[PDB]
Amino acid sequence: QDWGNLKRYAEANKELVRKGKQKDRVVFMGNSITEGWVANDAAFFEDNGYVGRGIGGQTSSHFLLRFREDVIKLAPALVVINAGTNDIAENAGAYNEEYTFGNIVSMVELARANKIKVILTSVLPAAAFAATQAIINLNTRIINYAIENKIPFVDYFVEMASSYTRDGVHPTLEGYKVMEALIKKAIDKVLGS
Amino acid sequence: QDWGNLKRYAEANKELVRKGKQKDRVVFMGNSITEGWVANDAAFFEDNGYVGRGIGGQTSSHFLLRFREDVIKLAPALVVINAGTNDIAENAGAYNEEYTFGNIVSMVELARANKIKVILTSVLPAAAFGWNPSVKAATQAIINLNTRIINYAIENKIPFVDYFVEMAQSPNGDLNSSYTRDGVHPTLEGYKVMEALIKKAIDKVLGSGSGWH
């Protein structure tokens, strides 16, 4: 058993460490949208020196368990954390806003303890404006925390289903292309500052 | 679902916060050893203002998941971490020293981010019994993990309480046979050895809490 799925990237991490620490490496942590980003446009990551560490179906608890191996040990300059909303889908009745939010705080604090800059992101489903309440309440709580602690963040807007989404939840390839320009702006500002 | 077992102490944490803030609270994070310590010797915790947050069978990965709710949100002065016994025992999966040691470091960094002092501790010696061939390899893993912990403690000026050296026996490095009956918990005599060490170390960090006596 390997509940956190540290196995998923363990060999890939080994191959990275063998190739030497890298300037301005950015790690993307997240669930299926982050996983699907690499699947849909691997060259965006490879060309930019970005490392995708997304795993579909996972919660912020899994992210916290993988954080040291899949982020800290890669010695990145910056980590993009897409976490929060997916716990509501995945945990359904057991979702607890305090626990999810606390996992995000924990990863921010681990990143900062290791001199890794942070961008928090969220991909807000279109029909989020049943779980609307939980999604908005969590996103607003993260926004307030981000402002109070000067954490840059990016709220990707998913249109109503559109050449950018089929279901109003997940990006198409074209939807990923427009998320790329936006996240790059955020990253290059954070790395330059 | 609640793989970390945040449910175990959720209600007890609520009732603790209801009773108000305590300046010198110490939280003990741990597995069956720590859970059974409160069961066998509640007075040691109650008399000294310590809070036990042990859960049986749990690994350092569980502890990392529970750390914010069961340590940070209790606003303690200090957290005692004893982690590793079940990582090595493999009751919850294969053992990886890097993963386990890294979970301990992550807890230390979360503690420090929250102005909580840390005492790190040795994983206890493995108990030899019957026809269990895994015990000699577990002892080598325990000693190697404790070495990673103690060098990290030295590097970061963190106190390290060496239960192991006081509870192991020669030549095999396994548990003093007197110090366990069930192979899961120290006996009370074993807990008393651990109490003298950890209380001395807590009092060194926080000062004497004896009051007027």
Side-chain angles (χ1 to χ4, degrees), chain A residues 1-6 8-13 16-17 20 22 24-114 116 118-173 175-184 186-188 190-193, chain B residues 1-6 8-13 16 20-22 24-45 47-133 135 137-165 167-199 201-213:
Chain A
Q1 174 127 8
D2 169 28
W3 186 83
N5 207 352
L6 277 70
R8 170 74 68 95
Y9 290 114
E11 289 296 329
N13 291 341
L16 277 182
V17 156
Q22 282 321 81
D24 299 324
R25 170 172 293 162
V26 181
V27 175
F28 284 66
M29 159 84 39
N31 72 286
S32 58
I33 294 172
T34 298
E35 191 178 2
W37 209 335
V38 176
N40 275 85
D41 189 0
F44 171 75
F45 292 85
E46 175 134 84
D47 293 350
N48 284 299
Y50 301 164
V51 183
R53 285 299 177 255
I55 299 179
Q58 287 211 327
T59 69
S60 67
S61 298
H62 299 87
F63 305 160
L64 178 57
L65 289 185
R66 301 197 284 114
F67 198 79
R68 179 165 303 282
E69 286 290 318
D70 286 351
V71 182
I72 293 167
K73 284 181 147 192
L74 275 53
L78 187 153
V79 59
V80 178
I81 305 170
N82 194 65
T85 300
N86 198 50
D87 284 21
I88 300 163
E90 295 296 343
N91 294 338
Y95 166 72
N96 174 320
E97 184 187 284
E98 277 293 322
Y99 294 173
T100 295
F101 173 76
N103 283 341
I104 295 163
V105 177
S106 288
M107 321 178 255
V108 173
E109 295 182 340
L110 287 176
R112 295 184 151 180
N114 284 273
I116 301 166
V118 173
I119 294 165
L120 300 170
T121 67
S122 155
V123 190
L124 289 188
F129 294 88
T132 306
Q133 187 163 23
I135 286 152
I136 305 302
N137 280 336
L138 175 60
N139 195 71
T140 296
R141 187 173 189 175
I142 297 164
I143 286 168
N144 286 325
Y145 167 74
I147 289 163
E148 175 53 33
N149 294 272
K150 308 169 178 8
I151 303 162
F153 70 93
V154 171
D155 275 23
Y156 307 107
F157 172 75
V158 189
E159 294 194 336
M160 302 291 182
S162 175
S163 49
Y164 300 126
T165 182
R166 180 183 174 188
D167 55 2
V169 180
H170 305 93
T172 58
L173 174 63
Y176 278 119
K177 299 316 291 207
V178 298
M179 302 166 51
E180 284 166 12
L182 181 50
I183 198 54
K184 281 222 63 189
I187 287 169
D188 290 320
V190 171
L191 291 184
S193 85
Chain B
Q1 161 53 40
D2 173 32
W3 186 84
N5 207 346
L6 278 302
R8 165 73 47 100
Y9 288 109
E11 274 313 307
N13 289 348
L16 262 193
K21 158 85 156 140
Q22 316 280 308
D24 61 345
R25 171 175 295 157
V26 179
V27 172
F28 285 59
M29 185 29 85
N31 46 42
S32 297
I33 295 162
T34 297
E35 184 193 62
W37 199 348
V38 173
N40 202 174
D41 198 2
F44 175 72
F45 296 81
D47 291 351
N48 292 298
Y50 305 161
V51 176
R53 285 295 176 260
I55 294 182
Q58 282 201 338
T59 69
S60 68
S61 299
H62 297 91
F63 303 163
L64 178 58
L65 290 186
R66 296 197 286 126
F67 199 75
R68 182 169 298 282
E69 287 292 319
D70 286 353
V71 178
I72 293 168
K73 285 211 182 158
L74 294 197
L78 190 155
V79 59
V80 179
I81 301 173
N82 185 245
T85 285
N86 288 104
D87 298 59
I88 287 166
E90 294 187 315
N91 52 293
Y95 175 62
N96 181 314
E97 183 189 274
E98 271 301 312
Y99 294 176
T100 293
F101 174 64
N103 289 334
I104 295 171
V105 174
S106 287
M107 286 182 288
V108 173
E109 290 177 345
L110 290 172
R112 186 208 308 131
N114 283 276
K115 309 214 253 293
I116 299 163
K117 291 269 190 32
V118 173
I119 290 170
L120 295 173
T121 66
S122 61
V123 180
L124 268 67
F129 189 88
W131 302 101
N132 183 2
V135 152
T139 290
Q140 289 222 153
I142 288 164
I143 284 167
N144 283 334
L145 177 52
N146 286 342
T147 294
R148 302 283 301 270
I149 302 173
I150 181 162
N151 273 335
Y152 176 84
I154 284 166
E155 177 158 292
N156 293 282
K157 276 169 178 60
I158 298 163
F160 177 83
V161 172
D162 198 345
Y163 303 130
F164 183 105
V165 73
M167 304 180 73
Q169 57 181 6
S170 184
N172 295 341
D174 50 14
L175 194 71
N176 183 328
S177 61
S178 305
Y179 285 164
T180 188
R181 283 190 290 272
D182 62 7
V184 176
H185 312 92
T187 57
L188 185 54
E189 196 193 352
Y191 279 127
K192 294 297 181 186
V193 162
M194 294 169 71
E195 283 172 10
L197 294 167
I198 199 54
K199 176 156 184 222
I202 287 162
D203 284 355
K204 187 137 178 310
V205 187
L206 305 183
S208 170
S210 312
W212 183 250
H213 62 118

